[PDB]
Amino acid sequence: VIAQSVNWIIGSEKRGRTDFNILPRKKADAKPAEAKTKLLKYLSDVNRLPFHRSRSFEDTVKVGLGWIEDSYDDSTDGEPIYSRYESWRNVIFDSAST
């Protein structure tokens, strides 16, 4: 019976995928915010971020937590900023944090 409930939760979050829409607080700079919005959308398209986020939340449903990376790496890979999933297994985090 575990599979039904877990699949329902992950499907519910998958139907609710969202993309960043940068809003300028001042809106004397609406164009910079809109450019940043395209930049984030381009990065999400290149890195396939929505799938990574969906898988991460799927793990946060089954197990305690999930991890997502947003870092900058240098290689022959075209994308400079990479957003990739790391499993709850392969991460060790400090427990002293409140």
């Binding site: 829409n21 929505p50 947003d70 400079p80």
Partner: protein
Amino acid sequence: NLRFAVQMQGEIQLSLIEQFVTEEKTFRITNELPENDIVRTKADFIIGESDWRATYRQAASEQLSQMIMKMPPQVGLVMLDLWADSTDLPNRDEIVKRIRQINGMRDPTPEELQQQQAAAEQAQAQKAM
């Protein structure tokens, strides 16, 4: 919790773009106080969420069409030519040109000259009469 961590990843990514992108890269991709970077950015720009909506331009067209639907029929046509411009029609230049022709809006040199000549002639004729 997912929402909170999504805001975290958005802030981190936005800092990464502001750090590691040149203006040339943005120009190719896109046609266009506190000490901390995160607080500095999060002051002027805040992270908001909309549905996936494929490219950004589709979401822009959706918001623009909603605004049109809120607009009355009069003022609706200029919002309409913007919506035609934003919406990914299979044939986009010609629809935009025609909606502009009926609307008269700008943003075409021959059309601008024709409109200016017509306006000047009509105004001069009215003044003479």
